[PDB]
Amino acid sequence: MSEFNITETYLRFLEEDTEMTMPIAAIEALVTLLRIKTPETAAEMINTIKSSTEELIKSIPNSVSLRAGCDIFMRFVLRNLHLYGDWENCKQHLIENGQLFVSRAKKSRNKIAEIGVDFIADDDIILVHGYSRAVFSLLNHAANKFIRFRCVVTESRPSKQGNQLYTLLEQKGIPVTLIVDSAVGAVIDKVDKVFVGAEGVAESGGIINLVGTYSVGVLAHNARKPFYVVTESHKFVRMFPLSSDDLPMAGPPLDFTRRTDDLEDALRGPTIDYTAQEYITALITDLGVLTPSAVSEELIKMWYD
Amino acid sequence: EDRLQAVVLTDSYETRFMPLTAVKPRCLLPLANVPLIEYTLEFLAKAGVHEVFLICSSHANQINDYIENSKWNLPWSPFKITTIMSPEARCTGDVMRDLDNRGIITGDFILVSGDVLTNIDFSKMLEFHKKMHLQDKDHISTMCLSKASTYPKTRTIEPAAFVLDKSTSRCIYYQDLPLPSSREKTSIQIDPELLDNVDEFVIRNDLIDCRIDICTSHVPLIFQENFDYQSLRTDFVKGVISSDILGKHIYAYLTDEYAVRVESWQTYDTISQDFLGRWCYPLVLDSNIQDDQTYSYESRHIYKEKDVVLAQSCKIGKCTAIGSGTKIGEGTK
């Protein structure tokens, strides 16, 4: 009898497929929590799932996609707790709704492409940043559409993700180079469109993914090239920062301590930046193309009370 | 006034296109990816006609298979479309005496010979015709002609001298004229006996023919007796103004913009580039009219339909057009 906390349920099926990502894995674990542990009373169910979400955030704090999944699960159990079935059917009604995310959010990524293929037009040199697999889910259907384009992939120092794209869509058959991440300003005068992928959307439209998407965003603004971001609808999160600095990793982004003998010195600054709403200009979700004030309204309506 | 009749008389230029044109007529050749009947037909449907009469002197079955599979034998077409089957290679003119022996045409009607492509609002050509009716009871027709003033010498087969009036633009006289390759034939003659009561006239070379003549139903009856005519203008408009029948004057109209007619490949190239460029507004290509294409328009004059596979590392320059389902490759230009 599993306890669903850390790895007795969650981290097992992350090794089943390296295509499922973190937040829908969190959705799958949280629905299979109360799919079995349903002790016929509406009180301790919500206590169990709130305890489970807080210990799962307590497992890995610096992967804020997890917070997005573990909080839209609370929105799911709140709205499915609504319609007021007196808990007599909801013990069966909520769990038969249940797996509609793993039948729904799993097949959201081609629904992204079905509305985002009509962005990359003919002969567009494209800049992507980091292994954001929804961007590749758009680009796969774009190359299957037989449309002519070129791609440029940045480095993802120190998180290594930029080396994956050049070994991902090269074998699909797209002419692609791998620029280094510092060389954006000398090339973004030539890049037609730039895509990124978020690990979170704030309450105004923000990109909380990686090391330097604020840098490539402010390069996109002072080259006046359109800065799109491909995401999907399990990436909304309540966390609305105000600076370019989020929750810390373990200390401040500006360390000034002493290296003892030979410890690592690359990851000493920040690793997850923030982008304001001005630098993004259109984001892609399951809900269509979505201007950032629309994503602000969409995350302002389902989070108030 | 209304109930406009019409007659298109194709299939007189098979001498021009002889390596082609023996397996399908001149009128069924794709100028811009679609066989150019409708480049006349959409024009004179916008002119608002009610019946046409396709003379098909050759390949008559592969006229009517396209005509019955067109959008014109469907019960909302602005004209009903009828054909005329034919023994082979009749000279023009005698088709009108065959028409008068049959006796269908009553009223004003278009003598559109050849295959034209134009932007002219034919509606404002009606009031020129009716001003001809009101200010002359001895009229014959009106002849719309283009003003291609920036180029003589390059309208290939026949250069002409449309000498006409200053004030009323009545066509005074007409004469065929030789070619720039011939330095030999250097004279034309206009004898001044019929030049008595004109006192003001203009003689121009920069008017290209387009064979769009609209007249009254009196002039086929005029044309009935004088059975000597075999062309439409080398013999007739000379032989109707040269003091032959008294009290029958012919008029001719000049437009200000693009209105052209197919002669040969040294005109087919030029009109293909004028139509495929934006020199033919509003009768343009990207509007996707004829056989419900999907042409889009980039800058630099690019025309592409859906399902076009442009391969990588190709370049596509000015003024091109690509149909659907094609496939180009690497390194092409």
Swiss-Prot record, chain A:
Disruption phenotype: Inhibits GCN4 derepression in glucose, amino acid, or purine-starved cells. Its main location: cytoplasm. Transmembrane segments: none annotated. The modification N-acetylserine is found at residue 2. The modification Phosphothreonine is found at residue 291. GO terms for biological process: cytoplasmic translational initiation; positive regulation of cellular response to amino acid starvation; positive regulation of cellular response to heat; positive regulation of translational initiation; regulation of translational initiation; translational initiation. This is Translation initiation factor eIF2B subunit alpha. It comes from Saccharomyces cerevisiae (strain ATCC 204508 / S288c).
Curated annotation (Swiss-Prot), chain B:
One of its GO terms (biological process) is regulation of translational initiation. It is found in: Cytoplasm, Cytosol. GO terms for molecular function: guanyl-nucleotide exchange factor activity; translation initiation factor activity; translation initiation factor binding. GO terms for cellular component: cytoplasm; cytosol; eukaryotic translation initiation factor 2B complex; guanyl-nucleotide exchange factor complex. Acts as a catalytic component of the translation initiation factor 2B (eIF2B) complex, which catalyzes the exchange of GDP for GTP on eukaryotic initiation factor 2 (eIF2) and is regulated by phosphorylated eIF2. Its guanine nucleotide exchange factor activity is repressed when bound to eIF2 complex phosphorylated on the alpha subunit, thereby limiting the amount of methionyl-initiator methionine tRNA available to the ribosome and consequently global translation is repressed. Present with 33800 molecules/cell in log phase SD medium. This is Translation initiation factor eIF2B subunit epsilon. The chain holds residues 24 to 356 of 712 of the full protein.
